[PDB]
Amino acid sequence: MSYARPGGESIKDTNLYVTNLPRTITDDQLDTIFGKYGSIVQKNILRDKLTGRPRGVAFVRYNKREEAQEAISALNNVIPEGGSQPLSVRLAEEHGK
């Protein structure tokens, strides 16, 4: 059915769309939660209350396909067990760092 998504390759373009992510943290904060796999070439947040385009979801960075895999586990739920709403990690089908 589906065996992992992102693959592997020097910093190219493999960011992942994190779904379900309230603004309880800061964009620069998601960096501290990572600081272990890659150097996250980005980190943003997208809301859908005045455009109707997205669906309450942020966008984590993971250029190197391999690094994106990290976000899969490492970023999956980028909050210490205690709510904070986790993010659904997965390489989106758009490619754009």
From Swiss-Prot:
An example Gene Ontology CC term for this record: cytosol
Protein name: Protein sex-lethal
GO biological process per UniProt: alternative mRNA splicing, via spliceosome; epithelium regeneration; female germ-line sex determination; female sex determination; germarium-derived cystoblast division; imaginal disc growth; negative regulation of mRNA splicing, via spliceosome; negative regulation of RNA export from nucleus
Tissues showing expression: Expressed in somatic tissues, but not in the pole cells, which are the precursors of the germline. Expressed in the anterior of the germarium.
Signal peptide (UniProt feature, chain positions): none
Claim: Nucleus is one of the keywords in the record: yes
UniProt KW Nucleotide-binding keyword: no
Keywords of the record: Cytoplasm, Differentiation, Nucleus, Repeat, RNA-binding, Sexual differentiation, Transcription, Transcription regulation
Subcellular location: Nucleus; Cytoplasm
Function: Sex determination switch protein, which controls sexual development and dosage compensation in females. Sxl protein is only active in females: it is inactive in males throughout development. Acts as a mRNA-binding protein, which specifically binds to a subset of pre-mRNAs and mRNAs and regulates their processing and/or translation. Binds nanos mRNA and is involved in bam-bgcn mediated repression of nanos mRNA translation.
Primary site of residence: nucleus
Domain RRM: 14-94
Subunit description: Part of a complex containing fl(2)d, Sxl and vir. Part of a complex composed of at least mei-P26, bam, bgcn and Sxl; this complex is involved in translational repression of nanos mRNA. interacts with mei-p26. Interacts with nito. Interacts with Unr; cooperates with Unr to prevent translation of msl-2 transcripts. Interacts with how; promoting nuclear retention of msl-2 transcripts.
GO MF annotation list: mRNA 3'-UTR binding; mRNA 5'-UTR binding; mRNA binding; mRNA regulatory element binding translation repressor activity; poly(A) binding; poly(U) RNA binding; poly-pyrimidine tract binding; pre-mRNA binding
Portion of the full-length sequence here: 199 to 294 of 354
